[PDB]
Amino acid sequence: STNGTAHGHPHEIILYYYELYPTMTVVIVSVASFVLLSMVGTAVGMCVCARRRCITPYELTPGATVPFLLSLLCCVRTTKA
């Protein structure tokens, strides 16, 4: 009893949870969480790197502003007053 296809997109993906065995979806969820953590860690690193770039030009004196736009969203808003 079935003439439906597989999945598309995830939907059916969760339907399989009924087949195979017990362990499955929870492990996948954990993997997804790990991926999210990697994504979050990357972003945190990127922000720190963005600071590393705005460093030097963190003292004072004209000089961007300037490259502060084009400028990874701060850069500016930052140059100003």
Place this chain on the structure above:
Amino acid sequence: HTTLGVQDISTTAMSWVQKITGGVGLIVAVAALILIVVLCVSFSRH
């Protein structure tokens, strides 16, 4: 069937998602390195 870790998923569709990933973590890693490189250029400039 035949192997272990429950294989499931999707040609096409499957490729759609796969193609995304490998793709943003590597990007931000490369960008990080490039930012370091530029920083060193500034350090050299001083």
Place this chain on the structure above:
Amino acid sequence: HTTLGVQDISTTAMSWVQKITGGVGLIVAVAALILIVVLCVSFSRH
């Protein structure tokens, strides 16, 4: 028939009018933003 808010109107003809709108409010909004952008350029120039 079948739904609620009394549907009426016109293929072609209908498209003629529809194509106009979405079209001038958005334009003046974009132009407003562009004027602000130029203003900021002048502010930076000073």
Place this chain on the structure above:
Amino acid sequence: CIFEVKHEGKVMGYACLVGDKVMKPAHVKGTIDNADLAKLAFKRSSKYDLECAQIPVHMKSDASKFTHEKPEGYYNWHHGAVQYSGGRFTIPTGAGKPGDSGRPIFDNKGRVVAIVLGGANEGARTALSVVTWNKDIVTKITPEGAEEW
């Protein structure tokens, strides 16, 4: 403009009001011995070994301007006269010790020209490792073998 960083009641380095920011070397342990300055939020920058914040409005009149203009010749600093040449600031070895970081190197018109971070001993004279202004942007010159003061 110069304020001292204290750690366990002991002067470790200095802090300086240059431009519109409040500077102090990142490597210096302690907290600026000034209420107004101490409660600020500093932005660290490990590349420059710098750690700046913004000067409160009531002290902004107390800042010191700095300049990219530095022709070969002699400059002024707390312990005497620094010498600039070959793109390098130097001093008689012994005249600069740990705990001198943050101290500005003024010119004869008072413009801060660089800020000492440490020095490399190369015999008779020590090449200073400083934070200096370029065309407009900050920069850091660190002679080979510097000892971070």
Place this chain on the structure above:
Amino acid sequence: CIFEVKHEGKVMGYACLVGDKVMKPAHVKGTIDNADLAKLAFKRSSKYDLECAQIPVHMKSDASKFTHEKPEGYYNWHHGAVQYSGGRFTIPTGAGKPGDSGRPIFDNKGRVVAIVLGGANEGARTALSVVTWNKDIVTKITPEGAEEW
């Protein structure tokens, strides 16, 4: 060239005849205490906090020219001498109070160099917030924390 804005019989700020326009800060309440000037039609500009109009032909001989040329040094203003440096006009804190807006900052040849709008107190000295001429066009410099006079 200088005319006073009065409000309920009380001087709030000033109005100035610069170039071929008649200026007065937008924030200043009142109306110029001069028949000819009062009946004019001003064009407000909230970005510049400026509010200009055109000088009647019979007063155009009474305008004051201004200039983009302003080298570091001392300038003249009603309360004394302003100091220009680092792209900032300053004065001894206390020498400028609310009700001084509109007052021009002349140089030694009489050319109006900027027009005071207010000032930010940064201790010993106050950085003025002024309207100044660029290459050709008007501009407004407002130090962080200005108090609009």
